[PDB]
Amino acid sequence: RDSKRKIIRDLQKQDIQYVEYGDTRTLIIPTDKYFMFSSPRLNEICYPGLNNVIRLLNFYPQSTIYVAGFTDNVGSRSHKRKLSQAQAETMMTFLWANGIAAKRLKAEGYGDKNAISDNAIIHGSAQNRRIEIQWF
Amino acid sequence: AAAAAAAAAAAAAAAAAAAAAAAAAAAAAAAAAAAAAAAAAAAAAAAAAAAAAAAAAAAAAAAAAAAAAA
Amino acid sequence: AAAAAAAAAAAAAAAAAAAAAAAAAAAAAAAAAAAAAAAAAAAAAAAAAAAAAAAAAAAAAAAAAAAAAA
Amino acid sequence: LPCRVDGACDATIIKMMTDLNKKGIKVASVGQNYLISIPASALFADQSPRLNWASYSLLNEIAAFLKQFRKIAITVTSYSSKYVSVKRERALTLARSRVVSEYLWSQGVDSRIIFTQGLGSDKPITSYTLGGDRSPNARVEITFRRAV
Amino acid sequence: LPCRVDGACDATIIKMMTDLNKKGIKVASVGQNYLISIPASALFADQSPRLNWASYSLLNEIAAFLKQFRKIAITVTSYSSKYVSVKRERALTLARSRVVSEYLWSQGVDSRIIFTQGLGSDKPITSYTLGGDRSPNARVEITFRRAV
Amino acid sequence: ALKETALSVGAQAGLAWRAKIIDEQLNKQARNLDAIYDFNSLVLEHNILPPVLLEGRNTLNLADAQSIRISDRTYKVAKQAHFITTPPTWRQYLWMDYVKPEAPKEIWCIYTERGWKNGIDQANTILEENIARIKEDFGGMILYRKLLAMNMVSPPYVSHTDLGVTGDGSEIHIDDRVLRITALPELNVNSAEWRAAVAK
Amino acid sequence: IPPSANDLLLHVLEGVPPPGSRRLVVSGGDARAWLSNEKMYVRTNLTILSPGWLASMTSADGTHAYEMQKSPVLLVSWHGKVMQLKVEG
Amino acid sequence: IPPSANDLLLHVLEGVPPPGSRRLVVSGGDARAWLSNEKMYVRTNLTILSPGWLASMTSADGTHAYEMQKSPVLLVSWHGKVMQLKVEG
Amino acid sequence: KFKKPPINNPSDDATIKLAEAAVSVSDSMLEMAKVEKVITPPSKDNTLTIPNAYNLQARASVDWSGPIEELTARIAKAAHFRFRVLGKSPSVPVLISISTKDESLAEILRDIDYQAGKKASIHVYPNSQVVELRYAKI
Amino acid sequence: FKKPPINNPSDDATIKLAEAAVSVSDSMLEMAKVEKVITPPSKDNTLTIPNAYNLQARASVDWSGPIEELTARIAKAAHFRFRVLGKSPSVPVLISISTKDESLAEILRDIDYQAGKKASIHVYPNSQVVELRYA
Fold this sequence. Notes:
part of a larger assembly; 10 chains; A: alpha+beta; G: globular; DotC (chain F); signal (chain F)
């Protein structure tokens, strides 16, 4: 009830994806409900997702952390890049300020250049707006 | 419909229905990419049935007689 | 109406009603600044319904056919 | 039909106005200039531009009180007592007022402008200067004029 | 009439998806990119491009899972751990993936392309390198994007 | 037949209900649509509404068996530039009309549900053409500002004939400026002064 | 040569209706509207935005008078708020 | 000298129907079809294959607009899949 | 249990097709703003004609769609700047529509000056306390 | 405890509509940056405030008509001499000031401005004379 299966089961409940993948472990966090709108201000009402993701990654205290930000097709490519970079960068500062040592972390912004769905449809672009958190 | 993932959340136009886990397999609108491959019409793939006729035969709008539907 | 401050003292034109403590939230006249944002009319925001027609369709005075009200 | 009430009632206006004066947020009502005066103890932490989590409930009937009026420009201005310098102080009070107006247009105002600014104890309502945010000088004030 | 379901149901999609994850074929579901990851122990013999006879049942709910989606290009790519050389290894994994895609378009996919390729442990998902096909690095992966 | 008039009862009620739902769904996004369809800061220097240009690339016409004509691009001036007083909003183009229809067994119930979705998606096609018309008109003005940069059209040439004090002794107008459009915005065919959209 | 304005906009720049008119009731805003001959005239101090007017004057105190075709809804700006006014007739 | 195209293909390259049309409902694919005068016009981004069209345009984003005679079925390619679309009218 | 991450509200068909129109008008828009800014380079800003000030560095948040002068009178009133017009206002209103949140008063007046392009101009004289609006010459 | 914003884009279509809204009105803003020609205040070629104590008095004027007559009586209300240089044309240079309180040098600034290019105003304050110049 304080363990891995409990905290991944309620991150399913507050709708953040997790993937187990060999050594690579990746949280997919929707920016649409974990950020206030088109901003790098964190959605402060959704704190228990943020406490639960940092409670999850106390379990891996030696892995380097890749954090990356994603948008969809709207706006200029500069706006895509700087908005994704700003949101990934402030999630990186959230993990640093909730206590991960700063040379484990890596913030990087992609203006939907990985694009896990198509941007031509509404729900697919909603899935494209995200933060990936990878570690080893 | 969108069964056992959750209930159907939205109905995304230019798509199928959107369940409250993922995208469903049930078509939302008429204009989605539903795999029609067998039509059911008189004089399909020639032009349509020229509706002004009142006789025995059925004439297409490309002036073929639909002998399979007369 | 103007409840529990006092009773309604006056009814100030070009304003809302005036309670006998302060200015109320109930509109006095028709011509106050009441927040209309959803109208209910045939051919609103084009020109109005051209009333001389007697047919199936409803034609606007800007000669559009109000197909949402025919 | 045209609407009689505009999503508001005068009984609820004076009910929130008594309840805000009972919780110590003082509502002055002069003409149509409305003032609600909030001590900075009752919202923030001391000498910080940061809300406490419980103080958004105080901002809840502040914003639900600000539902009730037709208004054009709310101005929100904050000032506290002296801590380091007037330059640090004015940066504090500018961040203070801009944070509370960011929450107030996150919430519901029907205002068209919120002007928001902070001052460096340049307008203090008492000469008694006890401390930091427990001073009654240390306050934010939300003033507007109720339109028609 | 137009068809509601396209020969598939979402209850059966998640029923196969739980059953494949219970038998250890891990289904990742990211956006509309679908990944099913198959350990090479669970299909082939060790360091061989040859199916076992029982593993076509594993390919049966792989192919009946691949019935359920509208898809354009499946790519199937295989890689294992080091056995002799990277050249022998890449020949092994190319034959490996082309054999499993030959069975998958013997079976039912509604894909228009299956791209199929193999790599020489060039992308290994763990640093722990126990052995041959019992390594969790030694795997085939079938990735596609579900169209609309 | 009673089943058919049950469907016809359900149709207009579904149309008016769907019209209602998308009217305050439009009004919920009212400031957002003023941001999208901002015609106000697309108007020209003498409050002239810009014309609607239509782009069609890569065009074929099969005229008969003997002959086709291809062209690579086609620009059309539709509903030419003119003096607007106040700029168009989105509400002339997008607002569907709300009237409240006050005109009222088992087969009646199932075909009033199929009439109800027929009214719903027929109101959806009316809204789809309304969005289509505003996207035509607004993107035509955007296509002007492309071609006015890109020198494929003329800007309008106004003329202000200033007049002084004007009239008889029963009526004066003091500063009497008559403003005309002499040259309309108009695609040039002398094509050597054209531009090309190269950026970085 | 165009006409100057309508000179009856001088009358509806005051509150007085045009001679031989029909009154139109206006809801939801401070305006008065009359219909002379298939054209309505609006005395307001608001700013009419959507349906477009043919002629306008303005008095000393910012009251405007508009000649326009008959549209059953008027859209104004009040003080930056987009506002609706509704006319019967 | 042939005609150029139809210039109403510019309108049905946008979503807007031609003036004085009849709507045709399209099943089984993302297309819109209107019938002006014994000719239908299809806005799609699919590729119509079997019944043959008389005129075509294409916008900036790969949307095409086709003038063709009235055929009750359209055959398209979607993404290499041969696909059928069905029109009533 | 399987779940994709964004489980948002139920949308409807109206804002579905409004959004997929709005992105095509957004990038047709983006494409020609790129075209015009490369076919004439903007040499100058307007911060040289609206310079900032201490007590112009107050912030505001504003949605607005009315005419320009009542808004800029409200900006200069809360900036404690005397507000002056130059030029008679045209009979058609010059209408701005500012919808922004948390900008400083100087960049709000610059946004006003930009949105009223060639119809008006905002000038600020900060060694005095004067906000001006000048209307155009036509 | 908390609330989200009320008309928030909390919906998967309205987020796309509103990110389109921020990108359209941003794309408006660089539209306006490219076509907004201004001129710098070094080269604004309008009259400044001539800061004389007679010209900082406190007036009121409501008028439309020809420029030379206000400038005459703005001079003789300023106790300034009025000179004219140049020729007034057949159509007069027309102007309207309708302000119930703004300052005198500030009337002078507006009437240089609303003159524009048909005429302009200089003030020489040591000699206490305003001049109107034509072209």
